[PDB]
């Protein structure tokens, strides 16, 4: 039961008790966002082609 690092202020206090010792770049993100948009556009064009038949 060792109490360490006791800091006291008017608002309260804090301390520690011890009981025992022991990213994608902007380009890579834009690439993935536009790839998904192209797959959406491709699926929509195939539907319009199917409806044109």
């Amino acid at each position: 039961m060792e109490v360490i690092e006791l800091n006291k202020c008017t608002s309260g206090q804090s301390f520690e008790v011890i009981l025992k010792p022991p990213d994608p770049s902007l380009e890579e993100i834009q690439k993935k966002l536009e790839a998904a948009e192209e797959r959406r556009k491709y699926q929509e064009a195939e539907l319009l082609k199917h409806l044109a038949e």
């Binding site: 929509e44 539907l47 319009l48 409806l51």
Partner: protein, 425 residues
């Protein structure tokens, strides 16, 4: 999030008219378009189905379509006939003769562009259109043949919008002509491809409910449309009133449709009481009847298949706590009838505003694999005639070939087998 409503053919316009009569009463709208309600819950989502024109009047966002003026004349002279926008009456004169080819390929093709002009005008005024709902039968010619032609062209012009239908399925017990299985089979394939949600309303089930349960000795079409009107009000409650679950057409589809083609729902309603009507129901009674086959509108036995998804909507002032435990009671008591590979597939919603004439009601929306019994029934009736090419000349006379019938037959058999795949998995 506006919905554009379309009603096509005799059945679609007669059922569509009753639907607008019922929900206009619930939202406090009179036949002149004026509001006379006592709660703001009636107006909070009124714009989903109504346009507000000048003078603080509400005009339904509804388009009335037919190849014959007869039924739509009756609508214009009906109770709420004056509430409909006069320009939204689009009709021809020749009729469709209960012929899918006439609705889809010849007579209907001549009229469809004028309907799409009205659809376009109603859509241009929507702040953010979310989709369309169509009411029609599958056994006739205009609603079935021209309705599915309409759905195809609407999808082409609005590919990113939700398409929802209330589709009345024919039955030899309530039949007008012998070609209804032909018309139903041709249009079911259209619905498989071009709608996101379809409420399967079987006229046999409506007849049996009117006769066996409601004790109506001689059911009329008006009696059948009473049930449909009450069912349509229930299944659209979550769209018309404030709520958290299935509040729009796309979230409903996401919750109800685990596979794109399997979007054919069994609707149900409770209470269904013969005329007693004054007896108050309890939440356990509402929940038991709502899941009972005798309250289903598709004439399929749910115990012959499994539930993929279920939407439940309780209306009225009731114990929300007791609602939750009764819903859990149903699932935990008969858990073999729900697929285990979709956890928590039963979603419940509660609305405080009850339907007219009732203090409490429950509406059932189920995506059950037992709906394959409906498509199998139509398929047997189709094959019994098509095997002898009987009555085909009505269709080949309009330019169709036998091959298109063979393909429609194979498509609906494929759909039946697709339901069989997920009933055992």
């Amino acid at each position: 999030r506006e919905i554009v409503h379309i009603q096509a053919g005799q059945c679609g316009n007669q059922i569509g008219a009753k639907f607008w009569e019922v929900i206009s009463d619930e939202h406090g709208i009179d036949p002149t378009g004026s509001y006379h309600g006592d709660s703001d819950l009636q107006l909070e989502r009124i714009n989903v189905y109504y346009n507000e024109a000048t003078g603080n009047k509400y005009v339904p966002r509804a388009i009335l379509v037919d190849l014959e003026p007869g039924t739509m004349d009756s609508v214009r002279s009906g109770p709420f006939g004056q509430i409909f926008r006069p320009d939204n009456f689009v009709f021809g004169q020749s009729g469709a003769g209960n012929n899918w080819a006439k609705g889809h390929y010849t007579e209907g093709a001549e009229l469809v562009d004028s309907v799409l002009d009205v659809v376009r005008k109603e859509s241009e005024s929507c702040d953010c259109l979310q989709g369309f709902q169509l009411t029609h039968s599958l056994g006739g010619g205009t609603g079935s043949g021209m309705g599915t032609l309409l759905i195809s062209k609407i999808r082409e012009e609005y590919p990113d919008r939700i398409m929802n239908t209330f589709s009345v399925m024919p039955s030899p017990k309530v039949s007008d002509t012998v070609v209804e299985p032909y018309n139903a089979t041709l249009s079911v394939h259209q619905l498989v491809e071009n709608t996101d949600e379809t409420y399967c309303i079987d006229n046999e089930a409506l007849y049996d409910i009117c006769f066996r349960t409601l004790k109506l000795t001689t059911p009329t079409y008006g009696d059948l449309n009473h049930l449909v009107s009450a069912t349509m009000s229930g299944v659209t409650t979550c769209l018309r009133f404030p709520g958290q679950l299935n509040a729009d057409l796309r979230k409903l589809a996401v919750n109800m449709v685990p596979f794109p083609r399997l979007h054919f729902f069994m609707p149900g309603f409770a209470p269904l009481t013969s005329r007693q009507q004054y007896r108050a129901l309890t939440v356990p009674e509402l929940t038991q009847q709502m899941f009972d086959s005798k309250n289903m509108m598709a004439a399929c036995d749910p115990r012959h298949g499994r539930y993929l998804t279920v939407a439940a909507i309780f209306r009225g002032r009731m114990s929300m706590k007791e609602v939750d435990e009764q819903m859990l009671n149903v699932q935990n008591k008969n858990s073999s009838y729900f697929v285990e590979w979709i956890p928590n597939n039963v979603k419940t919603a509660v609305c405080d505003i009850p339907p007219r004439g009732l203090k409490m009601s429950a509406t059932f929306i189920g995506n059950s694999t037992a709906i394959q019994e409906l498509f199998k029934r139509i398929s047997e009736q189709f094959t019994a005639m098509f095997r002898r090419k009987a009555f085909l000349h009505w269709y080949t006379g309009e330019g169709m070939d036998e091959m298109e019938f063979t393909e429609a037959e194979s498509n609906m058999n494929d759909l039946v087998s697709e339901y069989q795949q997920y009933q055992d998995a």
